[PDB]
Amino acid sequence: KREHWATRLGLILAMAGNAVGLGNFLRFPVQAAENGGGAFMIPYIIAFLLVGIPLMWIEWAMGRYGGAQGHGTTPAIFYLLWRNRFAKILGVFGLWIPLVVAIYYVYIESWTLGFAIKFLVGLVPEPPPTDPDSILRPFKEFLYSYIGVPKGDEPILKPSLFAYIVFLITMFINVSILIRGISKGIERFAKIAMPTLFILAVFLVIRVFLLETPNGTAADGLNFLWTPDFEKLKDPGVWIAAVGQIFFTLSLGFGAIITYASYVRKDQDIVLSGLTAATLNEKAEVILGGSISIPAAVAFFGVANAVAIAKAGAFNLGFITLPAIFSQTAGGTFLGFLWFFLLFFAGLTSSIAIMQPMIAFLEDELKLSRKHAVLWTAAIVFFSAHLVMFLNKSLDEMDFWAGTIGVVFFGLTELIIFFWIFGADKAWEEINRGGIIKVPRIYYYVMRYITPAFLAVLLVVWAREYIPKIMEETHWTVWITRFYIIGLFLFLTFLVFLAERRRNHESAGTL
Ligand SMILES: CN(C)CCCN1c2ccccc2CCc2ccc(Cl)cc21
Ligand SMILES: CN(C)CCCN1c2ccccc2CCc2ccc(Cl)cc21
Ligand SMILES: CCCCCCCCO[C@@H]1O[C@H](CO)[C@@H](O)[C@H](O)[C@H]1O
Ligand SMILES: CCCCCCCCO[C@@H]1O[C@H](CO)[C@@H](O)[C@H](O)[C@H]1O
Ligand SMILES: CCCCCCCCO[C@@H]1O[C@H](CO)[C@@H](O)[C@H](O)[C@H]1O
Ligand SMILES: CCCCCCCCO[C@@H]1O[C@H](CO)[C@@H](O)[C@H](O)[C@H]1O
Ligand SMILES: CCCCCCCCO[C@@H]1O[C@H](CO)[C@@H](O)[C@H](O)[C@H]1O
Numbered sequence: 001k002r003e004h005w006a007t008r009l010g011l012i013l014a015m016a017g018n019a020v021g022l023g024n025f026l027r028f029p030v031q032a033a034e035n036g037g038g039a040f041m042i043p044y045i046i047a048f049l050l051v052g053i054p055l056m057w058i059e060w061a062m063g064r065y066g067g068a069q070g071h072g073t074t075p076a077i078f079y080l081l082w083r084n085r086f087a088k089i090l091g092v093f094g095l096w097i098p099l100v101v102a103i104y105y106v107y108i109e110s111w112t113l114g115f116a117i118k119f120l121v122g123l124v125p126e127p128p129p130t131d132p133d134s135i136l137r138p139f140k141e142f143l144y145s146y147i148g149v150p151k152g153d154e155p156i157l158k159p160s161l162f163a164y165i166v167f168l169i170t171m172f173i174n175v176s177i178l179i180r181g182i183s184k185g186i187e188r189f190a191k192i193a194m195p196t197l198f199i200l201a202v203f204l205v206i207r208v209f210l211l212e213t214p215n216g217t218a219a220d221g222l223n224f225l226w227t228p229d230f231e232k233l234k235d236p237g238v239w240i241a242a243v244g245q246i247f248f249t250l251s252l253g254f255g256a257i258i259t260y261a262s263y264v265r266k267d268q269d270i271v272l273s274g275l276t277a278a279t280l281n282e283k284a285e286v287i288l289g290g291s292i293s294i295p296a297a298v299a300f301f302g303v304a305n306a307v308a309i310a311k312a313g314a315f316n317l318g319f320i321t322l323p324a325i326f327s328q329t330a331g332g333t334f335l336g337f338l339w340f341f342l343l344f345f346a347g348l349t350s351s352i353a354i355m356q357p358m359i360a361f362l363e364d365e366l367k368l369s370r371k372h373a374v375l376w377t378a379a380i381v382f383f384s385a386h387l388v389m390f391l392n393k394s395l396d397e398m399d400f401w402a403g404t405i406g407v408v409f410f411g412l413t414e415l416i417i418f419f420w421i422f423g424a425d426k427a428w429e430e431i432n433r434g435g436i437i438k439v440p441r442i443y444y445y446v447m448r449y450i451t452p453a454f455l456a457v458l459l460v461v462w463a464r465e466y467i468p469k470i471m472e473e474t475h476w477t478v479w480i481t482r483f484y485i486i487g488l489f490l491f492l493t494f495l496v497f498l499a500e501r502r503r504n505h506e507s508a509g510t511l
């Protein structure tokens, strides 16, 4: 009774949409810009080869394996691979991480829809005729008024009425797709969204490549991004940034690739399919995402200033700088619309992917109907999102624990359980089974020894030289978000406990 992807194309575009999202167009540019541009790319490429690709196959394999037995989420799948109560508990992260990411990701996605709407109808700011700030300030105030940045000392946000309603609409749109299921919902939408997304992105790159000012050209932006710095490879922070981006952009460690793969027929290839999805994401990221905002910013403000803007972070580059720059060109407001529409489709195809794990768990383990599973999941995300919408820095806290530390920790966890506990040879066999192509021989040793060792070191260095400076150097309000998401973990563990009991009570009625 489990759904399955209808076509190979659909599967590939759905998986591609899972990966290609806000991380490609917003996160990548910031990470690369603040880490030296080209100096970021070497570790990034290496991370993609030693972590991205191998974990992608591992997650597809685990998902297809679990699906064959009617399970699409990690609490059950981890137990199938390691029959130990602790496997179910660690598996909870496969529901918690995607749920927590969704709680702030859908909200950011809603901003892009709201901006798309306002830019389409021309309800945007109008700067004067060369001073930077005189042009950027109006756009900064525009964003600040939208999300309600604090004007006082209280760490409280005051979202505009329009932003709140657009978030509601955004949740509604995510639900309209998810409620139709895998083949008729997610797959059908991906076939529409991905082509649209690709065309919009190419057009924007072309337009940005035409940008030129007394300060530079788009070419200067590209040179900054693709010019190596072999003297930065010794910087740990750059590696942590690169690996973190690889996980986020490929949706690895979210339990999302696994859940999507659980709808792939038991015999269907995952080697070539997985590699293709990963390659598509990388193209969209380094070629499309990398060629839009960085080159535009560099062309208008020069490299030094572009970098400063990125380090200023706070969504400056994508929500303030790029539109401000576009406003200086004929048809620039429409150009802004295209940008935000692109971001919206990129985010939407990814948010449905990160919400599906909770949906699958409720359907697979608690036996809820798809309708009910989708509605309760949306309700939980909608409610919880109020924390991100009203408490300044809550978004940052969730993105750190789930979207940064969480995904890397879970990636290592799933690899250990699948390639070490379940059995390296059994895992290798499982990955290659039905493959249109075989995984290169060398990757067996990468998956069994290199990847885990690489991640283990990363995490160690991370928790010893970086985390401490946060667990003690933040406003007391970070504890509100920490308290809440720990509660979410507790609640999800309770649900796994209930699924466990329903299972036994149902098994007893069978014997
Ligand atoms: C209401 N639907 C009959 C219209 C079909 C188009 N559609 C779509 C396409 C594939 C799968 C699900 C959905 C339903 C919701 C939705 C939302 C936004 C857009 Cl941009 C298209 C879109
Ligand atoms: C610093 N914070 C204000 C933002 C944190 C979240 N964020 C994020 C999260 C989900 C989707 C898009 C983006 C875009 C901006 C960005 C840039 C770098 C990092 Cl590492 C995180 C990051
Ligand atoms: C069911 C959970 C309810 C949580 C309380 C939500 C209160 C939202 O309240 C609304 O917030 C909007 C954005 O700031 C404002 O524009 C509206 O005027 C305000 O009524
Ligand atoms: C896509 C549909 C969006 C509907 C929300 C529009 C929010 C526009 O703006 C709102 O308009 C209201 C009057 O209609 C005013 O009372 C509010 O003060 C104003 O912020
Ligand atoms: C942890 C998340 C808590 C969300 C509770 C939000 C309660 C909303 O509170 C309301 O917000 C409006 C707009 O900001 C204000 O105009 C109202 O005076 C205020 O009561
Ligand atoms: C983390 C929780 C954030 C909640 C945001 C609440 C925003 C509501 O706004 C607050 O309402 C209070 C009345 O109760 C007033 O005394 C405050 O001055 C006002 O800023
Ligand atoms: C560190 C990860 C490197 C990945 C690059 C793999 C390139 C594939 O390498 C090729 O694999 C084939 C099948 O195993 C072999 O028959 C070829 O001799 C070998 O060159």
Ligand code: NA
Residues within 6 Å of the ligand: 019, 020, 021, 023, 024, 248, 249, 250, 251, 281, 285
């Ligand atoms: Na991505």
Ligand code: NA
Residues within 6 Å of the ligand: 016, 017, 018, 019, 020, 021, 022, 345, 346, 347, 348, 349, 350, 351
């Ligand atoms: Na996406």
